[PDB]
Write an enzyme that holds these catalytic residues in place. Structure first.
Site, short mmCIF file in Angstrom:
data_model
loop_
_atom_site.label_atom_id
_atom_site.label_comp_id
_atom_site.label_asym_id
_atom_site.label_seq_id
_atom_site.Cartn_x
_atom_site.Cartn_y
_atom_site.Cartn_z
N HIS A 573 58.02 45.16 27.62
CA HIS A 573 57.33 44.88 26.37
C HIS A 573 56.01 45.64 26.31
CE1 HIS A 573 60.02 41.51 27.40
NE2 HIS A 573 60.26 41.47 26.10
C1 LIG Z 1 65.70 46.02 28.69
C2 LIG Z 1 65.08 45.62 27.38
C3 LIG Z 1 64.97 44.28 27.06
C4 LIG Z 1 64.40 43.88 25.85
N1 LIG Z 1 64.31 42.53 25.58
C5 LIG Z 1 63.78 42.18 24.46
C6 LIG Z 1 63.70 40.76 24.17
O1 LIG Z 1 64.08 39.85 24.90
N2 LIG Z 1 63.12 40.48 22.97
C7 LIG Z 1 62.64 41.40 22.06
O2 LIG Z 1 62.15 40.99 21.01
N3 LIG Z 1 62.73 42.73 22.33
C8 LIG Z 1 63.27 43.09 23.47
N4 LIG Z 1 63.34 44.41 23.76
C9 LIG Z 1 62.88 45.38 22.76
C10 LIG Z 1 61.41 45.74 22.86
O3 LIG Z 1 60.66 44.61 23.29
C11 LIG Z 1 60.93 46.20 21.48
O4 LIG Z 1 61.98 45.96 20.56
C12 LIG Z 1 60.57 47.68 21.38
O5 LIG Z 1 59.20 47.85 21.77
C13 LIG Z 1 60.77 48.26 20.00
O6 LIG Z 1 59.64 49.10 19.68
P1 LIG Z 1 59.82 50.45 18.89
O7 LIG Z 1 61.08 50.41 18.15
O8 LIG Z 1 58.56 50.73 18.05
O9 LIG Z 1 59.88 51.57 20.01
P2 LIG Z 1 61.14 52.44 20.40
O10 LIG Z 1 62.39 51.67 20.14
O11 LIG Z 1 60.97 52.85 21.86
O12 LIG Z 1 61.03 53.73 19.51
C14 LIG Z 1 61.26 55.04 20.06
C15 LIG Z 1 62.41 55.72 19.34
O13 LIG Z 1 62.06 57.09 19.06
C16 LIG Z 1 63.00 57.96 19.64
N5 LIG Z 1 62.29 59.13 20.14
C17 LIG Z 1 61.46 59.18 21.22
N6 LIG Z 1 60.93 60.37 21.44
C18 LIG Z 1 61.46 61.15 20.43
C19 LIG Z 1 61.30 62.51 20.10
N7 LIG Z 1 60.53 63.35 20.78
N8 LIG Z 1 61.97 62.97 19.02
C20 LIG Z 1 62.74 62.13 18.33
N9 LIG Z 1 62.97 60.83 18.55
C21 LIG Z 1 62.30 60.40 19.62
C22 LIG Z 1 63.70 57.16 20.73
O14 LIG Z 1 65.02 57.67 20.88
C23 LIG Z 1 63.73 55.77 20.10
O15 LIG Z 1 64.83 55.64 19.21
C24 LIG Z 1 63.92 44.85 24.96
C25 LIG Z 1 64.03 46.20 25.28
C26 LIG Z 1 64.60 46.59 26.49
C27 LIG Z 1 64.71 48.06 26.81
#
Ligand SMILES: Cc1cc2nc3c(=O)[nH]c(=O)nc-3n(C[C@H](O)[C@H](O)[C@H](O)COP(=O)(O)OP(=O)(O)OC[C@H]3O[C@@H](n4cnc5c(N)ncnc54)[C@H](O)[C@@H]3O)c2cc1C
Ligand SMILES: Cc1cc2nc3c(=O)[nH]c(=O)nc-3n(C[C@H](O)[C@H](O)[C@H](O)COP(=O)(O)OP(=O)(O)OC[C@H]3O[C@@H](n4cnc5c(N)ncnc54)[C@H](O)[C@@H]3O)c2cc1C
Ligand SMILES: Cc1cc2nc3c(=O)[nH]c(=O)nc-3n(C[C@H](O)[C@H](O)[C@H](O)COP(=O)(O)OP(=O)(O)OC[C@H]3O[C@@H](n4cnc5c(N)ncnc54)[C@H](O)[C@@H]3O)c2cc1C
Lengths: 645, 645, 296
Positions: A573
């Site tokens: 997280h």
């Molecule tokens: C093992 C695990 C367990 C989790 N458990 C929970 C849970 O219990 N509860 C919960 O609410 N959430 C959970 N999560 C999710 C997490 O807590 C959040 O949902 C996450 O921080 C989502 O944030 P985000 O979408 O902004 O970031 P991200 O999803 O990391 O956004 C990054 C995205 O951009 C893309 N990207 C990166 N670099 C580039 C680039 N150079 N060019 C193009 N695209 C790129 C990546 O492919 C990805 O799709 C879990 C995640 C994991 C991995």
């Protein structure tokens, strides 16, 4: 040629919301550069049980958080506070981002944290509409099956919280001040009215409940499926199978497999962006109005340094060719949650009957509740508003089976082979350690940048008088104190558990095995005989007590401190990498230029109170509003959902 | 436009040799696409002591093998044989490749391994000229200072090898058959004639010596420096500071910071190659004659799959757009060396005087010898030529101080705080485990591909009769048997050490602490009371012996097996990823097309007998010859060195 | 041909400032003939501890003020007042001049000395702006750690200066007349407000303080570095690695290794200047407007 003016970099949990609603209420051109493909047919990703290896072929039983086809694999630098061991944590690699490979929880973050932790214009009352919108779009589901374990826990909690309301202590851990003086613990009988911890007006910071909210949707057939940002916002209904918008969304383009290197940059108006296709060819999307960064906590600052904006001396030392702006706060101040682990044994004639219906399922996924607590009374590092407002500090969990790693299993000798076990977890929510991110190669998007994150650093006494080196020892030892107080909290529920289980007609015996109870009873004795100064005994060299009592208590602390370092999981997280006030303003806009803004979970100036999915979705909604200039997502009726296909 | 016909991908230990000598004796056009910069001024990389953190600022004391500015950081999949823990190993990132960040050893690999392990045209007599050339170009140096520890070890070894020559056993571990029947142990007195383990005609497979060969060069001033592939072959004398050849080497171009994505491909003649500059722009070097792959064990197969040649069903399932050739052996059969760890304690009036001059230095770098052994007598997995030829199996080492990780230090309680310790290591050289590499993203060069490498898998008994399931248990348990026999070997030298130290006027006491001796004496008793069938007791369910003796011996084996899994380092000495006979012929040429050839350490069909630096250099020299068509490096006089600046 | 009109001879502590700001606000042609190279990577010169021989190999433990690779080595004639012994003192040899090999102090020189010792147009009020500019460009740093020795000294000084204020003597050594009659000695307790001896209006000629100002800059990592005239004014941002200006400074040329012999001279308008490259060849830069001497 690929001219554009809306340019989103990354379809995370915040990229999908932003792109979907921005294209819904606007008619600009939108390119969404994503670097992943759509796992619409992959049975392991759709079926939630596939998270637990139902489909893995026998050779390769691994979890998607490790598989390189699914997740980026940064490796952190050795943790000097945990015996110099290096962790690997995962950002997702798919449309929808981390949501594709997550554990599906929805804790929204209470009133307190945003109201007193977030700047003007982001208070709880100013954004709660967005949170309503996103929790509405998902519409998660609960479990409604009975389990005697959760009832045992919740009635023990009631027992203890009744003492806590009396005795007048104003910051004990089972106290809520929005509900007068008493947290509303969920009732214990058939079909009792449920307590929703994600209440719309944030009444419940501290509470007890009986199941969680997960991102599934029961189908008509009888099978449950993953429901995530890519699934909702970007599915076949709106986006063509080649990556083109449909009808109303016709100005919406998705380049599925494209890694962005940097943003080519002119004057101080960024003009162009480069990406690399699977077939190996560079292209260039021209930028007319803005660019959007929604590429996760880890990679966003890296994008910024490679772009040109960041600390000049460091970037010049490694040799990035272009310098734009000197902002030595880029990518500083990372945070994350942490979760130690604790086991219990059961010994009685009908204990097997006491733990039925605890296997993970398609609706629970190895969760059985079971609470959410606040600061322990004897916590020294509390904010000045502790007395008048209750804070979300510990995220209690519970599960059947064994959670400790096989090596710890060998050491303690407690295995799931002997069926007497369940685990209680106190997921710290206000964890103190802060780290930072840099890059080492100004070349392309790697899979591992420099990440420094030190947790359990012990204090080194000096020759300064104790009277002015206690308040540096305190702030250094903060995480140890918090973890130990959580140990106390879990320890002093198990006896009420014994009582309520014996008195509910169940003849079983409960005794913690990992960590061993004897340590904990010694800790309890030391705590209530030494008072708030119990933490002075982390550094025995400063107290100067040679009485065997203090010597034994300090020894107990010393030998206990091994377990949070060894038997724990690191939470995925991540958050808070480009905070408001650090590198951006309240408009999310990057300070130093005119047409680049960051709109992801890196911008959060403080970690929220729960699994950090809903917060990033909120940030996406709000940034849609900010670019739009008018609130429509806030003003959409709550019961409109995007179509599901 | 960047037309080319010589196209080297990567300036590793084999890229530098190939490029340097290919450009010396030929007048084609040469582009060397390297992706790293030249650390000519960085004091940490030049000074060998900087390997041990003399220059690290206090916040960030790490080693260059971890720092992302210096080394690629793949993370392997969990090791099911070592409690499902995931390792990170480093390929270098600089001109000269891994050599820039290495530990500087020069074991050339004896006669036996290449003569009976390598195909026709690669026998020891057919390549030893190249090895002479490369060891000449480096000209490493030894230490010439006295240390009583090494003398103790070597005289104990003489004592024991005299018994081994008698008793007629033909494959015991201190036997050499090229020296009649007796390995030539180095003498023990002032200025005794040295034994060079890297002898030109490979007389010594098994031997004892007193210091190693490292890649330093004493300067006139008094300071030692790193001497590596980039330092020798490509320095300011031959290559311009912008990456252009000088005079005689004028047809030599070095694009320092360029990551190759794939090789664009036409008909079955690869025509073009793409790379990504630091400034983010794609380019394309046209290919007229050939392309060269010298990009390490890990990344070379990845280059091949992204290029288009590899297993069609898998690559199509992940979705690479172009298919060229269906070669389901691409990137199979990885190997590596392994090294458990062992400690000793010293207890006597003058032990501190017994261990002086053991601190690491600029010439030794924490090495104090001290041998190289062959198969133990009771090893069941020996080649059929064990009786008539002696094999290099165990690489003995020795060092002062403590080598075990701080967690193991806590568990055993033995710390370097109490100064009574030195370590003996038996680096396995013929290690059995074999793994494979795939990719998960057909997009660009990542930092972590799928790597599966399982070591210590335990046997699962079945209902088949023992009489035909012992010879699958044997081959499954092979690594355990080898590690345990190495434990026996180290154990049964320490008593001759006690004897020779007491008899050389030194009054000290030696007793192993990690692993504890009592386990080892029990093992010795069990070994010499159970014979060659000592390994039948890994699976107690098959022997069906209820006598307490066998029960206790099996228990001892069981509890001992914890330590090779826990207290060890994984060797960086990867090899054998695109072997001859698997995906290339004896001409190193890739099977299926006409103008691509691999010329790095991935092509080795077997791991050599030592730290795998010299072998890749040899392969570079030989491939220069193969492309040239005539032997000139073999025919160059031995005493011509490239200039050093 | 190397025609020029701005011709600076030497990149000292004054050559760097002059060349940098002259090229910033003017568009003439500028040649800076320096005779030294840029020790940007040399760990001994960047790390301030290298001043004290952390990197010297064991054979040759010397200080850069003696090493001939770093500093010019004049030898003075025997001092008849000190038993006829001959001293060697060092001018720097690098871009930035003596600053490369110095001890890094910043005492600006008080009001009194320039006001009553320097001619018209150079008084303290007429130049203090420039001093503000340069102390700003460097931005030196202090130490903030406690040491009982300095406290002992400063409280003893207070003790004695209280007698000196009385007894009416008008020129005793612990007297200040800008602060009424009493120099402002720095306080002695935890985090007392500091006294800056380089005050903008030169109030403090006589004073007591507790640490000095040195030309370092704490880096984010945890390591301190030298900060000097070459480091500030002429680094990779403005000057090419071959000695050419960058963009805004495009009319700025640095011949790194060039010793000037004389200035060839016509009528009474000096016309040309000669230098000697490392490769041994004379050249000649033609002079159109002026020549500058900043060579120590
Ligand atoms: C093992 C695990 C367990 C989790 N458990 C929970 C849970 O219990 N509860 C919960 O609410 N959430 C959970 N999560 C999710 C997490 O807590 C959040 O949902 C996450 O921080 C989502 O944030 P985000 O979408 O902004 O970031 P991200 O999803 O990391 O956004 C990054 C995205 O951009 C893309 N990207 C990166 N670099 C580039 C680039 N150079 N060019 C193009 N695209 C790129 C990546 O492919 C990805 O799709 C879990 C995640 C994991 C991995
Ligand atoms: C920690 C450590 C300890 C060591 N200790 C020893 C020791 O004691 N003794 C010993 O003899 N050796 C030692 N080594 C060195 C090692 O055993 C061998 O020297 C190594 O295998 C050299 O092989 P190579 O040069 O063919 O491969 P590499 O050096 O890995 O060649 C790969 C090169 O290609 C470059 N490259 C990779 N991908 C691309 C791309 N897409 N585009 C362009 N360039 C690319 C990389 O930057 C690198 O320069 C050590 C190495 C390490 C890391
Ligand atoms: C050992 C030492 C200690 C010091 N300690 C301190 C201290 O504590 N505090 C402090 O403030 N300062 C200190 N200094 C620095 C000194 O006090 C001044 O900074 C110095 O006078 C700077 O003056 P300048 O730059 O005008 O002269 P210089 O630096 O001497 O300028 C001369 C420059 O011109 C070059 N040059 C000379 N002849 C030629 C030629 N023919 N052609 C081309 N180029 C030429 C030289 O290479 C040099 O770069 C110290 C210096 C030294 C050597």
């Amino acid at each position: 040629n690929l001219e554009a003016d809306i340019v989103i970099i990354g379809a995370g949990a915040a990229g999908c919301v932003l792109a979907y609603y921005l294209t819904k209420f606007s008619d600009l051109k939108i390119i969404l550069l994503e670097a992943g493909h759509t796992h619409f047919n992959d049975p392991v990703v759709t079926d939630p049980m596939g998270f637990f290896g139902k489909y893995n072929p026998p050779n390769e039983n691994i979890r998607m958080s490790q598989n390189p086809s699914y997740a980026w694999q940064p490796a952190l630098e050795p943790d000097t506070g945990a015996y110099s061991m290096r962790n690997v944590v995962a950002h997702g690699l798919a449309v929808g981002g981390s949501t594709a490979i997550n554990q599906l929880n929805y804790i929204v973050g209470g009133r307190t944290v945003f109201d007193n932790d977030w700047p003007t214009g982001w208070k709880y009352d100013d954004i709660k509409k967005y949170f309503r919108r996103v929790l509405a779009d998902i519409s998660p589901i609960r479990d409604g099956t009975k389990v005697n374990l959760t009832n045992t826990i919740l009635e023990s909690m009631r027992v203890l919280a009744d003492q806590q309301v009396s005795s007048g202590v104003p910051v004990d851990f089972l106290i809520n001040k929005a509900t007068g003086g008493l947290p509303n613990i969920e009732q214990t009988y058939q079909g009792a009215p449920i307590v929703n911890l994600n209440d719309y007006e944030g009444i419940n910071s501290v509470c007890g409940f009986k199941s969680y909210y997960v991102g599934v949707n029961q189908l008509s057939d009888g099978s449950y499926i993953r429901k995530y940002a890519g699934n909702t916002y970007l599915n076949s209904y709106y986006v063509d199978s080649n990556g083109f918008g449909i009808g109303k969304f016709s100005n919406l383009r998705v380049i599925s497999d494209a890694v962005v290197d940097r943003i080519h940059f002119e004057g101080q108006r960024a003009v162009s962006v480069t990406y690399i296709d699977k077939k190996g060819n560079l292209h260039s999307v021209k930028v007319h109005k803005e660019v959007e960064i929604c590429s996760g906590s880890f990679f966003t600052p890296t994008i910024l340094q490679r772009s040109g904006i960041g600390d000049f001396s460091y970037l010049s030392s490694i040799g990035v060719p272009d310098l734009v702006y000197n902002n030595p706060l880029v990518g500083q101040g990372l945070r994350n949650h942490y979760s130690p682990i604790t086991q219990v044994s059961v010994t009685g004639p009908d204990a097997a009957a006491f733990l039925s219906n605890t296997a993970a399922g398609p609706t629970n996924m190895s969760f059985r509740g079971a609470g959410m607590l606040g600061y322990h009374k004897l916590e020294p590092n509390k904010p000045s508003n502790a007395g008048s407002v209750t804070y979300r500090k510990y995220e209690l969990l519970v599960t059947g089976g064994v959670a400790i790693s096989a090596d710890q299993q060998y050491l303690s000798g407690i295995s799931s082979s002997t069926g007497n076990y369940f685990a209680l977890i106190a997921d710290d929510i206000r964890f103190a350690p802060v780290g930072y991110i840099k890059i080492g190669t100004p070349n392309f998007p790697r899979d591992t940048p420099k990440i420094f994150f030190n947790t359990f650093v012990n204090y080194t006494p000096t020759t300064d008088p104790a009277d002015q080196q206690w308040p540096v020892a305190q702030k250094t030892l903060a995480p140890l104190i918090s973890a130990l107080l959580g140990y106390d909290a879990i320890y002093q529920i198990v006896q009420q558990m014994k009582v309520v289980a014996v008195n509910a007609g169940f003849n079983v015996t409960l005794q913690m095995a990992y960590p061993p109870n004897d340590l904990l009873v010694e800790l309890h004795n030391g705590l209530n005989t030494y008072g708030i100064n119990w933490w002075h005994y982390f550094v025995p060299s400063l107290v100067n007590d040679d009485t065997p009592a203090g010597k034994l208590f300090a020894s107990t602390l010393s030998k206990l401190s091994y377990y949070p370092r060894s038997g724990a999981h690191l939470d995925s997280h991540q958050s808070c990498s480009c905070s408001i006030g650090g590198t951006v303003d309240t408009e999310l806009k990057v300070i130093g230029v005119e047409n680049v803004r960051v709109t992801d979970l890196s911008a959060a100036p403080h970690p929220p109170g729960g699994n950090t999915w809903c917060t990033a979705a909120m940030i996406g909604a709000r940034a849609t509003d900010l670019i739009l200039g008018k609130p429509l997502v806030a003003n959409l009726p709550p019961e409109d959902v995007p179509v599901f296909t």
